[PDB]
């Protein structure tokens, strides 16, 4: 159970490995399902030009 940059043991905590341990990128999981308009859910949709 050791410091980062300990003199005898190599760890992923150590500053010498900076930039080799890059996270994977992912979707915005904290976004809710996208807000459609509520009037369009109750009013009648019709053909238009």
């Amino acid at each position: 159970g050791f410091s980062a940059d300990h003199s005898q043991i190599a760890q992923t905590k150590d500053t010498m490995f900076t930039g080799y341990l890059d996270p994977v990128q992912a979707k915005d999981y904290f976004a809710e399902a996208e807000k459609t308009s509520i009037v369009q859910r109750v009013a009648q949709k019709i053909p238009m030009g």
Partner: protein
């Protein structure tokens, strides 16, 4: 650190230690720096300059 093997650190160490062992033999034979008691003489002992 073994699971990730960042920058091939584990392969690189196995090359650097071999050079450290070659340098240790040269320094022991020329300058007698840390030589074992079983080595008989080193070149820096000469009384000629």
């Amino acid at each position: 650190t073994v699971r990730a093997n960042p920058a091939n650190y584990l392969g690189t160490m196995r090359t650097k230690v071999a050079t450290a062992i070659a340098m240790a033999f040269d320094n022991a034979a020329l300058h007698g720096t840390n030589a074992p008691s079983a080595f008989q003489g080193y070149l820096d002992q000469s009384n000629k300059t």
